[PDB]
Scaffold this active site. Structure first.
Site, short mmCIF file in Angstrom:
data_model
loop_
_atom_site.label_atom_id
_atom_site.label_comp_id
_atom_site.label_asym_id
_atom_site.label_seq_id
_atom_site.Cartn_x
_atom_site.Cartn_y
_atom_site.Cartn_z
N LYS A 93 40.33 31.25 52.36
CA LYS A 93 41.34 30.11 52.32
C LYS A 93 41.64 29.82 50.80
O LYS A 93 41.16 30.29 49.91
CB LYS A 93 40.60 28.75 52.71
CG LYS A 93 39.18 28.70 52.39
CD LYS A 93 38.78 27.61 51.46
CE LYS A 93 39.49 28.05 49.89
NZ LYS A 93 38.96 27.26 48.68
N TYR A 139 39.84 21.38 52.47
CA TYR A 139 38.53 20.85 52.97
C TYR A 139 38.65 19.66 53.72
O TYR A 139 38.44 19.58 54.84
CB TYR A 139 37.46 20.85 51.96
CG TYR A 139 36.87 22.32 51.53
CD1 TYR A 139 36.20 23.01 52.58
CD2 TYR A 139 37.28 22.74 50.65
CE1 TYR A 139 35.94 24.41 52.10
CE2 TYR A 139 37.08 24.32 50.16
CZ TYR A 139 36.24 24.84 50.95
OH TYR A 139 35.77 26.36 50.51
N1 NAD Z 1 35.35 29.20 51.19
C1 NAD Z 1 34.73 28.88 49.89
O1 NAD Z 1 33.51 28.11 49.63
C2 NAD Z 1 35.65 29.47 48.65
C3 NAD Z 1 34.88 29.05 47.50
C4 NAD Z 1 35.39 29.96 46.28
C5 NAD Z 1 36.40 30.49 46.33
N2 NAD Z 1 37.25 30.72 47.64
C6 NAD Z 1 38.31 31.45 47.82
O2 NAD Z 1 38.23 32.91 47.46
C7 NAD Z 1 39.06 33.76 46.58
C8 NAD Z 1 38.55 33.88 45.19
O3 NAD Z 1 38.01 32.94 44.48
P1 NAD Z 1 36.91 33.34 43.26
O4 NAD Z 1 36.58 31.99 42.98
O5 NAD Z 1 36.09 34.07 43.90
O6 NAD Z 1 37.71 33.90 42.26
P2 NAD Z 1 37.50 34.67 40.76
O7 NAD Z 1 38.54 34.75 39.96
O8 NAD Z 1 36.01 34.56 40.56
O9 NAD Z 1 37.59 36.31 41.60
C9 NAD Z 1 38.82 36.93 41.68
C10 NAD Z 1 38.66 38.38 42.30
O10 NAD Z 1 40.19 38.91 42.46
C11 NAD Z 1 40.23 40.10 41.44
N3 NAD Z 1 41.67 39.77 41.07
C12 NAD Z 1 42.59 40.47 41.37
N4 NAD Z 1 43.81 40.02 40.80
C13 NAD Z 1 43.40 39.08 40.08
C14 NAD Z 1 44.37 38.50 38.96
N5 NAD Z 1 45.82 38.78 39.08
N6 NAD Z 1 43.80 37.80 38.04
C15 NAD Z 1 42.38 37.00 38.30
N7 NAD Z 1 41.89 37.75 39.47
C16 NAD Z 1 42.02 38.64 39.97
C17 NAD Z 1 39.10 39.75 40.36
O11 NAD Z 1 38.92 40.93 39.65
C18 NAD Z 1 38.05 39.29 41.11
O12 NAD Z 1 37.41 40.43 41.78
C19 NAD Z 1 40.23 32.37 46.72
O13 NAD Z 1 41.30 32.33 47.59
C20 NAD Z 1 39.53 31.28 46.73
O14 NAD Z 1 40.48 29.96 47.16
C21 NAD Z 1 36.73 30.11 48.70
#
Ligand code: NAD
Ligand code: NAD
Lengths: 340, 337
Positions: free
Chosen positions: B100, B188
């Site tokens: 999401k 949420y």
């Molecule tokens: N359901 C849940 O509990 C929950 C919780 C956290 C994150 N999320 C979702 O998951 C996704 C990722 O969130 P996250 O916290 O893991 O993020 P994060 O920034 O920690 O991870 C991002 C990942 O995508 C890559 N990436 C690709 N292009 C990128 C760019 N242009 N700049 C930065 N990162 C890039 C990164 O290398 C990394 O592997 C989002 O859509 C977020 O809304 C959902």
């Protein structure tokens, strides 16, 4: 006890919370009763040990002026009758304790304060929460910056309004009430947001909805949601409801931590907790003894009629916003004399 | 574990919640990794026991089409990249698990569903709360009429957004995010109000405010408050914040009783109470598996992810215009809430 109280309106709140509340006072005492029912009053007077010689009614009310033992009167009647007896009470040269809401009009709120100034007597509104140790503790920790910078306040205050012939309940008559759940209980959320944040809303938005097929909400609203913004940039969203069970819940979000008050404004033991990544002072007693001491020391009371007016005025703004659908400016320089 | 997963995006959520989540699965397994960093991917592959032979990147991603052990892909990249890899994933004939928000556009949400239908593959959005026993229990007791007639829902979802050079957090950049705290976490509350009430908002109102001097909220909003009305006459007021600490709190008021979920949507042990065994992550993963293994529709389809995105848009519209926004567009949650 050396401060005499004249209780006006032996209703549910008087009989259930206030009269018993005197038991804990250390200055206040029940000196006289007032009510459109002597039979009831009699039983009551006996019950609390008051000479039936001091049982008045809405006709000979002014008679209290001739009893110097009666330091003050405590209005506990429907909202519309607040201003009437408040002024007459002052006319008899006696300090006034008026329940919330102050009145069903901003004007009457001002009038009451005038009368007070005139009679050179004090006017205190029944914001028991301003004397509840739990709430005061919440306020303390916020001022000590334990939440950090405040950013989001959330309040909810609800209780099911009896359906038994709504023509009976004075809370369902716009004339006797002045408003719906907001005037009756939302006011706790509104008032709390203010003293919890320690500031006034400069802008206000709201929306209301009541089932068109519910006999109860033909004159007063059932549910209403309001959102406010403050100078510090803090925000709030709260609501009051007449069709859902007991809810008294406040949350204050800071950048450091979050405060949760649930129950927030109840009659008995309120609870507060903090999430970071009542010694001889029950509200009722403390409220009564607070007006006493104020007099016994010429000191200003914590909950003046100016404060009760601010709420009423805000409540108007909120109803206006709900009516128009537009935000409403409320930045009119009000200032809490003494603090929150 | 017969269902092979291809994890796309070894970020904070993947490394901290999802990968470890597999430990409890009973059908799913980590088959392949994908990331713009094979160095890490390597350490990771080793760590979870995946042959480094299956470490792809955003170039040779489509290569997955040639690996039949790869049943599905799990996108966990910034919101804007969701639709891109979702479709390419379907093009490689593989079921998709997308986090999401579904996407940063209603269009892309529709496009993704199309692609899915085309490839005849399934599309499931990452609403772990739909697999959290605690939330399901809350839903159960509401349906069993323990609260009575629902009248007032209240939600709050907040967490301090790191200030460390906002040009570093893809969440603080409109293009990659699509929105502020609402898109990120308010969702949420919005989503919960819907499945807690078991119905859709027909009308929506909102307001937003972010400090004009805070470098973080130059593109995405910090705090936003929204109010909704439903057909049953129920009401709701919720908010999301990027400048106040951890808050996950839902309250549902009925005429009989009041439900309190706090924490409501956390990673670990959520709490619910009324006033008068398993874990979301695993259950989420194994849910897509079984759906496939049984030609049964998934509980959190892309149609649901789209509904939220569309609602969020109406909420942003309302906040922008200051007028209420009609959202009574006949959406229907096939299967239920
Ligand atoms: N359901 C849940 O509990 C929950 C919780 C956290 C994150 N999320 C979702 O998951 C996704 C990722 O969130 P996250 O916290 O893991 O993020 P994060 O920034 O920690 O991870 C991002 C990942 O995508 C890559 N990436 C690709 N292009 C990128 C760019 N242009 N700049 C930065 N990162 C890039 C990164 O290398 C990394 O592997 C989002 O859509 C977020 O809304 C959902
Ligand atoms: N601070 C609190 O915790 C709290 C709680 C309950 C009530 N209140 C306030 O106290 C006041 C009284 O509330 P209550 O619950 O005791 O009400 P109630 O109806 O139980 O009592 C009303 C009293 O006023 C008299 N009365 C005079 N005219 C009346 C009329 N026209 N119709 C009906 N009653 C009339 C009644 O005889 C009775 O003595 C209100 O202003 C209310 O908002 C405050």
């Amino acid at each position: 006890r050396r401060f005499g109280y004249a209780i006006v309106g032996l209703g549910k709140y008087a009989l259930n919370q206030i009269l018993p509340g005197f038991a804990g006072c250390q200055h206040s005492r029940i000196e006289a009763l007032v009510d459109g029912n002597a039979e009831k009053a009699k039983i009551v007077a006996a019950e609390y040990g008051v000479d039936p010689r001091k049982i008045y009614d809405y006709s000979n009310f002014d008679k209290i002026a001739k009893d110097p033992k009666i330091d003050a009167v405590y209005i506990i009647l429907p909202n519309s009758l607040h201003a009437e007896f408040a002024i007459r009470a002052f006319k008899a040269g006696k300090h006034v304790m008026c329940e919330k809401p102050m009145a069903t009009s901003v004007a009457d709120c001002q009038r009451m304060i005038d009368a007070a100034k005139a009679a050179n007597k004090k006017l205190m509104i029944g914001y028991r929460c301003h004397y509840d140790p739990m709430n005061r503790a919440a306020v303390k920790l916020i001022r000590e910056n334990q939440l950090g910078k405040l950013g989001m306040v959330t309040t909810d205050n609800s209780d099911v309004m009896d359906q038994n012939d709504p023509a009976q309940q004075w809370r369902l008559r716009r004339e006797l009430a002045g408003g719906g759940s907001l005037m009756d209980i939302g006011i706790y959320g509104l008032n709390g947001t203010r003293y919890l944040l320690g500031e006034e809303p400069i802008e206000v938005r709201a929306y209301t909805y009541s089932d068109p097929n519910d006999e109860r909400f033909v004159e007063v609203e059932d549910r209403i949601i309001w959102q406010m913004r403050f100078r510090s940039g803090a925000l709030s969203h709260g609501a009051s409801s007449y069709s859902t069970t007991t809810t008294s819940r406040f949350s204050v979000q800071g950048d450091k931590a979050v405060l949760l008050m649930d129950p927030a404004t109840g009659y008995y033991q309120n609870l507060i907790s903090v999430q970071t990544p009542m010694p001889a002072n029950n509200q009722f007693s403390a409220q009564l003894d607070h007006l006493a001491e104020a007099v016994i020391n010429n000191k200003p009371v914590r909950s003046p009629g100016e404060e009760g007016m601010q709420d009423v005025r805000l409540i108007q703004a909120i109803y206006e916003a709900a009516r128009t659908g537009r935000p409403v400016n409320t930045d009119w320089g009000y200032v809490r004399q003494g603090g929150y």
